[PDB]
Each structure stands twice: as structure tokens, then as C-alpha cells.
């Protein structure tokens, strides 16, 4: 009776998913984080707590696939609680979530935020988990025995400072009593929600299957949040990158700047080769296109529809290995731009004809529909052609 929807970004991040996830929570009773750690979040800066915590009817789940720093989580809980939110009644946390602890962060540093080494412990069948907080004897004996190895690696191998065991025990003294009312078998709860016919939103940041204990055939719709152009933060291959004045104008209109560093992001044309792979890997049902108004006023637009490698071969998907992008170039289609503003448009027919043709061409190339268009920051500044939960 209910519908189970996955929402994820389709490019390299910064697709503008925050406003869209918030909009979708209007139709969900349940919101689930199932992967990742504390990496990026909607605006307080919430990195671990799922998005629907503001809506009073929504239950929020941190499922077993999330690795979490408990002090990071309690700090978010207290920050929300200070703003009055009854967080503890509506937040639920898997007993199976592996913990991110100071030795994980230290390992990351010596190699160069703790997320990787936490997943490493899990794969090695040695990770401390939320459930271990409730067996304080086991928590201390595993923590001590884990530190014997990690501190050895940290000091005898990387010549970096150790993580003190006693101080970690002192820091963890309150964690069990603080988390206790919220811990549970999250997969069981999700399947009970599914049985009751409630709408469940899986908020992408490990798949839904393993990360939430939720079989693939129960997923009804995968929404891919997709920016009308492409951005990158890190270095490395970016075939549609613009190093010119159009790229600079996209950066300014899109406010494409690091929220912490202030460094401009790399900007470029829409890349349908990248999107083809994202669609296949995630069986994406439809797209939500964001920031279309950034392109308002450009004379021409380009869309990369293929890649041509160094040998001149035509590629329909990005190559697997990063070194294979060396001497690789995009194959572009050209579409005419528009001059009228598309900002805050609320009905498709109000868009200029060339904006609608741009959106139609993306649909034709990718073979899936654009079911949502975001034209500005407000919630009602969205066109929904087909609702993910309908």
C-alpha cells in the first residue's frame, strides 16, 4: 500500500538535494539514512540526523549501514534539542551501526574523516558497534584490545601520537544512557512500516539493500537529483569542464563555492555520459533537475553525449580506470539558449520554449523522464510532473 523511494545525487555532489529531500518528507512517514557518515548535510548543519526531523509525523532511522561518531551524534541531538525539537521520541538508531572513534580519525590523519577506517574495522569483523555500548565490560575489553593494534600501527608504523585508552573510556561513559531510548533493530521497524503501508524515503548520501536490510524488489522509485550543469570539487578528470568565461558565469550564478573553504568549484556542461552510468548503476526511475536558472541568458548550451578516447574510439560510458581519461574529450550536442528568466517558475508552460526543449533533449538522450524541476530555493519553487510517492 505504501511506496518506498530512494533519493540520491547523480553527479559529483552538490546537486542541490537538500531542498528536494525536505519537500519529499511532506509525503513520507519514515526517512532512513543507510550509508556514509557525517560528510554533508542540509541547513544548523545536520550531518548524521536524517532530514525529516522537523516534520512532527516523521520517524527518522539511522540504519546499520551508517558509521557514526557518537559524540558527533549527541552533539547534533543536543543542538536540535536546544532549539526545542523532541528528537529522542522520533530518532531511531541501529544497534549494528559501527562506531567512529578517535583512533579511526587518527589513522586517517597518519595516512594523509574516520569513516574509512571504521568500515575497515567492520569488514575485519572487529568493529565496535552501538550495541556494544550496552555491554560495558565487552566495550572496554574490545576497545583496549583494538587499541593495542591501532596504536601500534599509529606509533610503530606511522610515527604519529597514540590514542589514550583511559580517556576514550571516560569520554564514552555517558553514551549508553544517552542513546538507550533510541536504539533498536532498524530493519525490523522498516519492514513493519512497510507492512502498515507507510511511505518510506531512503535518503542517499553500501546500498539500501545491505545498509538498511531492505530487499531490492521493495524499492518502488529511485529519484536522481541532477544539476542542469556539472560541478566538481576535487582534482582529476572532468571532460566537460569549462575554463572560460561561461564557466566563470556559471560559477557565479550557481554560487558554486566551497561552503567552508570558499574555493570556487570546477564547473562544466551537462554530461549525459556520466548520467547514463548513474542511471544504470542505481536503476534511476526519473530525474529532479536543479539550478536550471543558472543557465538563463546563455547564447548556446552544450551536452556531452559521448566520449572519444586517445585512440579516437567513441565511448558511451565513462571508463572505469582514472588513467583512461588521459587525452579524452567530450562529444557535444549544441542547443540554443534562452534569455527569459526561469527563476521560481511554477508551471512548465511558463518556461521559455528553448528551456523546455533543453529539458526534453536530456530526457530523450537519457531515456528516463524529468519528473521534478527545481527553479529556486523555496519549497513551492518546484514543479512536480510526477510524484515519487504517487
SS3 assignment, position 166:
helix
Question: Residue written as cell 575489553?
Answer: 141
Interface with a copy of itself (CB under 8 A), residue from 13, 18, 206, 337: 206
Q: Is 323 in the site for a copy of itself (CB under 8 A)?
A: yes
Identify the CA nearest to 285 among candidates 203, 215, 387. 387
SS3 assignment, position 294:
helix
User: What torsion do the CA atoms of 280, 282, 288, 294 make, to the nearest 10 degrees?
Assistant: -70
Q: Which is nearer to a copy of itself, 130 or 294 (CB)?
A: 130
Interface with a copy of itself (CB under 8 A), residue from 55, 113, 191, 361: 191
Q: Which of 27, 42, 191, 309 is catalytic?
A: 42
Q: Is 105 in the site for a copy of itself (CB under 8 A)?
A: no
Interface with a copy of itself (CB under 8 A), residue from 124, 173, 347, 390: 124
Interface with a copy of itself (CB under 8 A), residue from 157, 235, 347, 349: 157
Q: Interacting stretch for a copy of itself, rule CB under 8 A, among 25-33, 232-240, 300-308, 317-325?
A: 317-325
Catalytic annotation present for 42: yes
Distance CA 141, CA 84 (A): 37
Q: Is 213 in the site for a copy of itself (CB under 8 A)?
A: yes
Q: Is 366 in the site for a copy of itself (CB under 8 A)?
A: no
| Pairing, β 300-308 against β 270-271 | parallel
Distance CA 380, CA 386 (A): 15
Q: Which three cell numbers stand for residue 341?
A: 528568466
Identify the CA nearest to 306 among candidates 242, 365, 374, 237. 365
Cβ 283 to a copy of itself, closest distance in Å?
2
Distance CA 143, CA 58 (A): 35
Q: Is 189 in the site for a copy of itself (CB under 8 A)?
A: no
Interface with a copy of itself (CB under 8 A), residue from 18, 41, 131, 237: 131
Side-chain half-sphere exposure of 36, counting CA atoms within 13 A? 15
Q: Is 108 in the site for a copy of itself (CB under 8 A)?
A: no
Identify the CA nearest to 304 among candidates 233, 240, 388. 240
Catalytic annotation present for 104: no
| Pairing, β 300-308 against β 314-315 | antiparallel
Interface with a copy of itself (CB under 8 A), residue from 25, 59, 187, 230: 187
Q: Which three cell numbers stand for residue 304?
A: 556531452
Q: Is 282 in the site for a copy of itself (CB under 8 A)?
A: yes
Q: Which three cell numbers stand for residue 145?
A: 584490545
Interface with a copy of itself (CB under 8 A), residue from 82, 84, 216, 235: 216
| Sequence-distant (≥ 6) Cβ neighbours of residue 26 within 8 angstroms | 55
Q: Is 215 in the site for a copy of itself (CB under 8 A)?
A: yes
Cβ 212 to a copy of itself, closest distance in Å?
10
Q: Which spans of this chain sit near a copy of itself (rule: CB under 8 A)?
A: 95-96, 116-117, 119-120, 123-125, 131, 135, 149, 152-153, 156-157, 185, 187-188, 191, 206-210, 213-219, 221-222, 279-285, 317, 319-321, 323
Enzyme catalytic residues: 14, 42
Amino acid at each position: 500500500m505504501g511506496k518506498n523511494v530512494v533519493v540520491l545525487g547523480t553527479q559529483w555532489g552538490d546537486e542541490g538535494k537538500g531542498k528536494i529531500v525536505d519537500l519529499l518528507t511532506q509525503d513520507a512517514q519514515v526517512v532512513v539514512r543507510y550509508q556514509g557518515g557525517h560528510n554533508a548535510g542540509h541547513t544548523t548543519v545536520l550531518r548524521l540526523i536524517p532530514s525529516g526531523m522537523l516534520r512532527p509525523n516523521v520517524t527518522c532511522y539511522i540504519a546499520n549501514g551508517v558509521v557514526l561518531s557518537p559524540q558527533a551524534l549527541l552533539s547534533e541531538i543536543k543542538e536540535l534539542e536546544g532549539n526545542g525539537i523532541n528528537v529522542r521520541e522520533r530518532l531511531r538508531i541501529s544497534l549494528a551501526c559501527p562506531l567512529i572513534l578517535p583512533y579511526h580519525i587518527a589513522l586517517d590523519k597518519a595516512r594523509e574523516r574516520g569513516i574509512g577506517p571504521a568500515y575497515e574495522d567492520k569488514v575485519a569483523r572487529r568493529a565496535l558497534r552501538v550495541g556494544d555500548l550496552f555491554h560495558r565490560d565487552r566495550f572496554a575489553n574490545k576497545l583496549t584490545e583494538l587499541l593495542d593494534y591501532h596504536n601500534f600501527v599509529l606509533t610503530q608504523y606511522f610515527k604519529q601520537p597514540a590514542v589514550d585508552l583511559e580517556s576514550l573510556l571516560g569520554e564514552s561513559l555517558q553514551w549508553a544512557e544517552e542513546l538507550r531510548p533510541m536504539v533498536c533493530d532498524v530493519s525490523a521497524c522498516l519492514h513493519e512500516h512497510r507492512k502498515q503501508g507507510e511511505n518510506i524515503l531512503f535518503e542517499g548520501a553500501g546500498s539500501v539493500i545491505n545498509g538498511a536490510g531492505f530487499g531490492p524488489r521493495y524499492i518502488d522509485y529511485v529519484l536522481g537529483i541532477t544539476k542542469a550543469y556539472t560541478t566538481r570539487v576535487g582534482g582529476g578528470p572532468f571532460p566537460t569542464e569549462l575554463l572560460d568565461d561561461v564557466g566563470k558565469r556559471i560559477a557565479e550564478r550557481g554560487q558554486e563555492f566551497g561552503a567552508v573553504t570558499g574555493r570556487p568549484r570546477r564547473c562544466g556542461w551537462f554530461d549525459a555520459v556520466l548520467l547514463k552510468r548513474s542511471i544504470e548503476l542505481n536503476s534511476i526511475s526519473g530525474l529532479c533537475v536543479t539550478k536550471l536558472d543558472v543557465l538563463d541568458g546563455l547564447e548556446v548550451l552544450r551536452i556531452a553525449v559521448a566520449y572519444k578516447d586517445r585512440d579516437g574510439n567513441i565511448l558511451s560510458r565513462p571508463p572505469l580506470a582514472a588513467d583512461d581519461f588521459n587525452d579524452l574529450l567530450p562529444v557535444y550536442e549544441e542547443l540554443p539558449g534562452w534569455q527569459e528568466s526561469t527563476a521560481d517558475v511554477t508551471v512548465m508552460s511558463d518556461l521559455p520554449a528553448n528551456a523546455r526543449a533543453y529539458l526534453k533533449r536530456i530526457e530523450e538522450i537519457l531515456g528516463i523522464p524529468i519528473d521534478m524541476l527545481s527553479t529556486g530555493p523555496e519549497r513551492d519553487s518546484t514543479i512536480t510532473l510526477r510524484g515519487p510517492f504517487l
